[PDB]
Amino acid sequence: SHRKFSAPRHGSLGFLPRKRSSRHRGKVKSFPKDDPSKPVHLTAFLGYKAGMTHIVREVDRPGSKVNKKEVVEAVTIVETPPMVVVGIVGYVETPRGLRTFKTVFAEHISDECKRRFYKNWHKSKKKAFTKYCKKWQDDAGKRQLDKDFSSMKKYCQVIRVLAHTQMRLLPLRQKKAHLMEIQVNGGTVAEKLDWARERLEQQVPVSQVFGQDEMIDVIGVTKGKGYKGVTSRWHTKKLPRKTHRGLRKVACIGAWHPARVAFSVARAGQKGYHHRTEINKKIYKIGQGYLIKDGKLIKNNASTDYDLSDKSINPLGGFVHYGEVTNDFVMLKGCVVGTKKRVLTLRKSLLVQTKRRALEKIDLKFIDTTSKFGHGRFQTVEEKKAFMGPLKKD
Amino acid sequence: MKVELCSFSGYKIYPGHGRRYARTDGKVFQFLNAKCESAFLSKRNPRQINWTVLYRRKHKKGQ
Amino acid sequence: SGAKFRISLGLPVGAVINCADNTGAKNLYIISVKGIKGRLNRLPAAGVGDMVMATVKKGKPELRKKVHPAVVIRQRKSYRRKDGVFLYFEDNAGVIVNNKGEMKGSAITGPVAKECADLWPRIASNAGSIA
RNA sequence: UAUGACUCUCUUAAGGUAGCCAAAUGCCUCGUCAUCUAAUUAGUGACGCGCAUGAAUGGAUGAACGAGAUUCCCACUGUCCCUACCUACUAUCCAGCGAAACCACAGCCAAGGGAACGGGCUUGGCGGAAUCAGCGGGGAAAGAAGACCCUGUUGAGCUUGA
RNA sequence: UGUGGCGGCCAAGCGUUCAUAGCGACGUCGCUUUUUGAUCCUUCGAUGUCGGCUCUUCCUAUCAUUGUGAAGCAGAAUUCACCAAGCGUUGGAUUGUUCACCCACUAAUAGGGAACGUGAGCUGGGUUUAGACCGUCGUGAGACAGGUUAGUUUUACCCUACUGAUGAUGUGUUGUUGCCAUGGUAAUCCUGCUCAGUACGAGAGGAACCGCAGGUUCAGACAUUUGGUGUAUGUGCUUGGCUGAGGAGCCAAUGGGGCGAAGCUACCAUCUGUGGGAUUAUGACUGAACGCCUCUAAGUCAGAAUCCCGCCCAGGCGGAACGAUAGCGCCGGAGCCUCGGUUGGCCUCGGAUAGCCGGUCCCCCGC
RNA sequence: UCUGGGUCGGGGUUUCGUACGUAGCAGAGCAGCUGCUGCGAUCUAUUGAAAGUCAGCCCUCGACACAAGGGUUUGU
Ligand SMILES: [Mg+2]
Ligand SMILES: [Mg+2]
Ligand SMILES: [Mg+2]
Ligand SMILES: [Mg+2]
Ligand SMILES: [Mg+2]
Ligand SMILES: [Mg+2]
Ligand SMILES: [Mg+2]
Ligand SMILES: [Mg+2]
Ligand SMILES: [Mg+2]
Ligand SMILES: [Mg+2]
Ligand SMILES: [Mg+2]
Ligand SMILES: [Mg+2]
Ligand SMILES: [Mg+2]
Ligand SMILES: [Mg+2]
Ligand SMILES: [Mg+2]
Ligand SMILES: [Mg+2]
Ligand SMILES: [Mg+2]
Ligand SMILES: [Mg+2]
Ligand SMILES: [Mg+2]
Ligand SMILES: [Mg+2]
Ligand SMILES: [Mg+2]
Ligand SMILES: [Mg+2]
Ligand SMILES: [Mg+2]
Ligand SMILES: [Mg+2]
Ligand SMILES: [Mg+2]
Ligand SMILES: [Mg+2]
Ligand SMILES: [Mg+2]
Ligand SMILES: [Mg+2]
Ligand SMILES: [Mg+2]
Ligand SMILES: [Mg+2]
Ligand SMILES: [Mg+2]
Ligand SMILES: [Mg+2]
Ligand SMILES: [Mg+2]
Ligand SMILES: [Mg+2]
Ligand SMILES: [Mg+2]
Ligand SMILES: [Mg+2]
Ligand SMILES: [Mg+2]
Ligand SMILES: [Mg+2]
Ligand SMILES: [Mg+2]
Ligand SMILES: [Mg+2]
Ligand SMILES: [Mg+2]
Ligand SMILES: [Mg+2]
Known part of the structure; x- marks a missing residue:
């Protein structure tokens, strides 16, 4: 017979393979659409989650009850040291999809990025790109490199650039850098390649990628919680106290005549460590890192136009379970996905943002x-x- | 913005911290944390509690 | 123009609050909350400023054995305002109000929350204290 | 208006008296009224036309008592809104030791037909070693030659006007 | 498919007039198996027999919401009908109930199926053993879809399915960065301000589009703040006992009680939740058939909670680029095994079909 | 990369609430001496003291030794 009272479904079937993520670094599944009218820029960056804190701010929204009243809002700090560009990869559009075409790495690759190519840096002889780096210092290699760049200009439509993080400016235990392809969005392919060619072996800060009060997306892996029951995993109803075979269970997992168990039935498994993309987080503040000038250091990051203090974004005793933020940071409104010290991908929005909340x-x-x-x-x-x-x- | 002072201890209450207690006969108090909150609701004298500002001012500690 | 921000509701169906006016009623048994669509096995519940249907349990006999509309003016459950302030009261209190919004009684004993006073002007008129 | 003390008639050994009741007893029935609730097929108090109440097959009452049945209120609480966290022993893995139930062959589905609900047949969908922790949809899962129903010219316990 | 439920055809009449806005007698044709029957085909070397709770999916005969047509549609409210199952359809008193009835909220509180879904998922209130009481029946033992009370709910470690977790094929070995073939898929509804006391209406009343502020249900997160937990057994307080006493401690299956870091966690705190395409219903354009007309026949336009794709989730006995490659790679006569199939090659316009093909440029424009 | 982590110590943060001892002409009082000396819960000062604080908190560039290793496979 029918269900006696109607009830909405527990959980979503759109995030259905609730498994451990096959990747640790968040992956841009779709970059913003490129148009030749805009100038040449980057579409993504890579930061590390430090911690959260408060903002008291002044709200300008006409018609609300909280118009011209101060609010307290939670914000998340992500430490974003500048990244090093170490190569360019090209793509061609095929009827089977988007096939990669040619990858050209830079002459000098740091030991941070060279750590990524090894499972055991301690036992390795550190031989990565040693025969490749002799292509930038002879004429028969330079001519080949120019023919490779010309072929990418002639045949490629999508240009992505290879950039890695700088782990020695972070208080983390890891020294192995994170590599990522960032899609370069701008004008033609020829000037798009002649932009990344000069930015080879160079540092790109977060200010070149993101601006102030930009609505961005955060891509990252959820903090892991292990093998969980169905009550925690899918938030189903707890069975009453008189239940004999346990109460943290789903009572009926299916009918008779569909003699299988359905894929839409809430069942126990891995909860957490899922790859998520949360859209529409506002950048409240792009802070400036520590820098020494005239002998003394300028650390007044958390000082505002009204506070007028000499304090940094670091709380008293430092951020819990992260360390000290001594580099550039991005202050996002609300919470972002993942645990502390986790690498996160900050992506420019896929949507046009015509709203007073987005344009505040x-x-x-x-x-x-x-x-x-x-x-x-x-x-x-x-x-x-x-x-x-x-x-x-x- | 206006910072408050704790009704039990006397410490400065920053805008995101603490709670406020409005009694039936008026008299809105504010509290820094649940320790001072439980000390107020258990009817305890701040002048007999060592870490409060009032005990230091009564016993003339510091200066 | 401005609309009510949601708060930490903590007064479900069956809650006995006290009647903070001079109608002669002592309690208010909340039998339902207005504006609640619902959910399977989820009680309707209210915060301050929410109109509920209530029932007098002890008091004057001409107010008992019937359903009244009422507005909750004080709650014991701590609720967060947009200023980052968590506020709670000593008791859960409501007043008897008709379907339009005017108060049945005349005076209010005790403070009235700002979330209730900004929505109900005839309760804010008779309120002695705010928040 | 109705009900109707009173009368007539039919009748059996009398024709249910005092009480009591929609009871542990009332089919209709969730009877009617009052009270209890915001709302009561529940509870209590009355009404008695009682299918089918009733006086040692005992009637009515009633203090104290009851691991007896039922209703309501105060207080109390994770029973619940609505779940969360912690502890111990498990479950997990390892060293050693180590069974049993069950087993035609075995094991992915949709529809068809068929002993009228297929794992096998037909037509389609398709299918990739070996495994681990859970799980209760299916195996019309296991246990036990259905205790219900019927048959047997099979019985036993008990009763009587066989 | 009698009965139940649902839908038609005809049209005597109802509808102040007026068969067909909305209904519809007397007749008659059907559909469905969510009602009860009828039957006895399967099951008696046993298919666990009512409800409720929980959970997933499907149907449309659509209650609300999106888009619309018709009214006896002035507005508001409400009826009839179409595309339409995407998303919802609640909290309670009574009863074991299914059903029913009432209170309240709501946008609506629509109907159903899945062995009358769901007992190695629960529960055991009812039904349905043995103990007892009452009424009726029987001489009696006893009987009663007549009441009442108490009455053991076993097993998964096998196979599959599902949920997660290793890994496997083969690219010479490994590593990095990637593509997406395929599967899944998600957002939904309401209120207030303004429009506006405006259109409309004699009046009473009383909208709608664009905007603004929020909220409900759901989904994904997260712990800065508030709350919870707390054996950091962290720090005080304290009962009984013990170490001769002080000091320092211990035991009482966590002795008990305050406060409590980190971690975990709550609509009990906070953050976020989206864009196109072809089109359905429908309204149209041009325009015949049929000298007129006509949304249709050829042709064309707008078009939506539907559909598909995007965003998001996973990533194929599926590819790609690139790095490093230890006795191994690259280039230039002999034979030995094994697997096999074959017995000349076409190195290319676009396309039309009630139309094509090749020249010619003495013409006119350009790449 | 004369560098790297680890351990210890230190500093920061934070939790609880003022440690032991000493001193007091503070102490309801009581007793023994002829004002003194003892018993005495509690109070005051030293003393926001004492104690804990990563095991999954944050900085140390302070001491200590360790880290240039072992095994099994892989070819175009
Ligand atoms: Mg339904
Ligand atoms: Mg049980
Ligand atoms: Mg904290
Ligand atoms: Mg329920
Ligand atoms: Mg009588
Ligand atoms: Mg009851
Ligand atoms: Mg009675
Ligand atoms: Mg008798
Ligand atoms: Mg009798
Ligand atoms: Mg073993
Ligand atoms: Mg079989
Ligand atoms: Mg075969
Ligand atoms: Mg099973
Ligand atoms: Mg069986
Ligand atoms: Mg037999
Ligand atoms: Mg015979
Ligand atoms: Mg016999
Ligand atoms: Mg015998
Ligand atoms: Mg005889
Ligand atoms: Mg019929
Ligand atoms: Mg007529
Ligand atoms: Mg026959
Ligand atoms: Mg059988
Ligand atoms: Mg079975
Ligand atoms: Mg339809
Ligand atoms: Mg069933
Ligand atoms: Mg079952
Ligand atoms: Mg069972
Ligand atoms: Mg029973
Ligand atoms: Mg019995
Ligand atoms: Mg096991
Ligand atoms: Mg797809
Ligand atoms: Mg007008
Ligand atoms: Mg907290
Ligand atoms: Mg706490
Ligand atoms: Mg906590
Ligand atoms: Mg001691
Ligand atoms: Mg003992
Ligand atoms: Mg506590
Ligand atoms: Mg058309
Ligand atoms: Mg069109
Ligand atoms: Mg369109």
Whole structure:
């Protein structure tokens, strides 16, 4: 017979293979559509999740109750050191799809990027690209390289560039860099290639890729939770207390005459470590990294136009389970996917953004830097010392 | 923006922290954390609790 | 113009709140919440400013054994405002109000939440304290 | 208006008296009224026309008592909204030791036909070693020569006007 | 398919007039197996026999929502009908209930199937053993789809299916960065402001499009804040006992109780959730058939919660580019095994069919 | 890459709430001496003290030794 009362389905069948992700780095499944009218730019970047904090900001939206009132909003900090471009890959459009055509790497490749090509850097003789790097210093290799770039100009329609992260500017344990193809979007293929050719062996910061108050997408792997039951995995109803064969179960997994178990039935398995793409996160702030000038360092990242302080984005005691953020960072509104110290892919939006929420202008009034390692109650150590006074240890 | 002072301890309450307690006879209080909140709702004197600002001001500690 | 932001609702069906006015009613048993579409095995529940249907359990006998409309003015459950402030009250309190929005009684004993006062002007007129 | 003390008639050994009741007993029935609720096929109090109540086949009542049956209220709580977290022993893996149930052959489906619900047949969809932890849709899964129903010119326990 | 349910044809009449806006007698034709029958084909060396809870999918005979046609459609509200199953269809009192009835919310509280879905998923309220009580029947043992009460719910470690987890084929070995063939697929609805007390209407009343602010249901996350947990057994407090006492500690199956880091976690906190194409219903254009007319016959336009693709999820006994390649690679006579099939090659216009093909350029434009 | 992690120590953060001892003409009082000396829960100062703090917190460039290794396979 029919179901007695109607109820919506638990879970989504659109994220259906809830398995462990085959990749650790988030992957751009679709880049933004290229048009020749726009100038030549990058469409993606790669950051590392540090932590979250507060913003007190001034809201400009006409018609709301919260118009010209201060709000408190959660933000996520992703540390984004500048990336190094080490090669260009071309693509051709085939009736079977989009076949890669030719890859040309740079002459000098750092040990960060060379670590990626090995499972054991300690036992390796570090021989990667050693016979390849003798192609940039002889005439018979340079002519071949120019013919390879000319063939890519003649035959390629999609140009992607190879860039890797800089792991020695991070407080992480890993030294092995992350490589990624970024689709170069701009004018013709010829000037698109003659842009990446000069940016070979060069550093691209996050300011060349993203602007202030841009609505971007975050691609990354969910934090893993292991083999979970159906009550945690699919959020089904808990069976009552009198249930004999366990209560954290789905009671009926199917009818009789469809004598299989359906693929839409909620069943136990791996929860977490799923590759997700969350769209429409606003960039509240592109911070500036630590830099030494005239002997002393400029670390006042979390200072706003209203705060006028000398504090960094790092809270008291540092970010919990991450480290210290000493490079450029991107402040995204709300939470992003994944755990801390996780590599995330920041992608430009696939959509045209014609909305007052998407086009709202953000000014920061206050960034909270109290300790996240407990209930912190002091913004800075100088404020803490000025409130507490002298202790016994002095 | 206006920062508050804790009704039990006396510490500065930054805008994202703490809670507010509005009693039936008015008298809205604000609390830094659940420790000071439970100390207020258990009817305890801040002048007898060592880490509060009022105890330091009464016993003339610091300076 | 401006519309109500959602809050931490914590007063389901069956909740007995107290009646903070001079109608002679003492309690208000919440039998349902207006504006609730529903969900399978999910009780209708309300926060401050939500119109509910209530029933007087003790008080004057001419208010008992019938359904009244009411507006919740105070809740004990902590709710977050957009200013990042978590607020809660000492008790759960409501007043008896007709279907249009005018109050049945005259005066209010105790404060009235800002989320209720900004939506109901005839309760904010008789309110002694705000938030 | 109705009900109807009263009368007449038919009748059997009398024709149910005092009580009591939609009861553990009332088919109709979720009877009617009142109360309890916002809402009650439940509960309680009345009404008695009682299919089929009733006086040691005992009637009515009733303090104390009850691991007896039922209704409501206070207080209390994860019973629930709506789930979450922690601990111990398992389950997991390893060293050693190590069974049993079950088993025509075996095991991916849709439809057709067919002993009228196929794993095998027909037509299609298709199919790729060996495995691990779970799981309860299917094997019309296992246990037990159906206790229900019928037959047997098969029985037993019990009763009586056989 | 009698009965139940649903749908037609004819049209006497109802509808102030008026058969057919909406209905429809007397007749008559059908559909369905969500009703009960009728039958006895399968099952009695056993297919677990009612509900409820839980969970997934399907149907349309569409309650609401999208797009529309018709009214006895002025507006508002409401009826009839089409494409249409994408998304929803609730919280409760009573009863074991299915059903029913009432309260309240809502946008609507539509109907059903899957062995009358679902007992090695639960429960055991009912039914349906043995104990008892009442009423009726029987001389009696006992009987009662008549009430009442108490009454053991076993096994998966096998195969498949499903959920996840290793790996396998073969590209000489391995590594990096990628493509997507195929499967899955998701967002949905409502309120307030303005429009506007405006159109419309004698009046009472009373819209809609574009915008703005939010919310419901769902989905995916996440822990800065609030809450929960807490054996960091972290730090105080405390009962009984014990180490002669202080100090420091221990035991009481976590002794008990405050506060509590990290981690995990809650619409109990927070963030995010999208674009095209062909088109359906329908309304049309041009225009015959049929000198007129006609959305249709040829041709053409607009067109949507549907469909398909995008976005997103997985990544083929499926490819690609590139790096490094240890006794191995690249180039220039002998034979030995094994697997086999074959017995000259066509090195190319685009295409039309009620039309083609090749020259010629003395013409006119250009690449 | 005279460098790398690890351990220890230190600093930062944070949790609880003011450690032991000493001193006090603080202490309801009581007792023994003729004001003193003892018993005394608790209080005050030292003392936001003491204790814990990555095992999955953050910086150290402070001490200590270790890390230039072992085994099994793979060919166009
Ligand atoms: Mg349904
Ligand atoms: Mg049980
Ligand atoms: Mg924290
Ligand atoms: Mg329910
Ligand atoms: Mg009598
Ligand atoms: Mg009841
Ligand atoms: Mg009675
Ligand atoms: Mg009798
Ligand atoms: Mg009797
Ligand atoms: Mg073993
Ligand atoms: Mg078989
Ligand atoms: Mg065969
Ligand atoms: Mg099974
Ligand atoms: Mg069986
Ligand atoms: Mg037999
Ligand atoms: Mg015979
Ligand atoms: Mg016999
Ligand atoms: Mg015998
Ligand atoms: Mg005889
Ligand atoms: Mg019929
Ligand atoms: Mg007529
Ligand atoms: Mg026959
Ligand atoms: Mg059988
Ligand atoms: Mg079976
Ligand atoms: Mg239809
Ligand atoms: Mg069944
Ligand atoms: Mg079953
Ligand atoms: Mg069972
Ligand atoms: Mg029973
Ligand atoms: Mg019995
Ligand atoms: Mg096992
Ligand atoms: Mg597809
Ligand atoms: Mg007018
Ligand atoms: Mg927290
Ligand atoms: Mg807590
Ligand atoms: Mg916590
Ligand atoms: Mg001691
Ligand atoms: Mg013991
Ligand atoms: Mg606690
Ligand atoms: Mg047409
Ligand atoms: Mg068109
Ligand atoms: Mg279109």
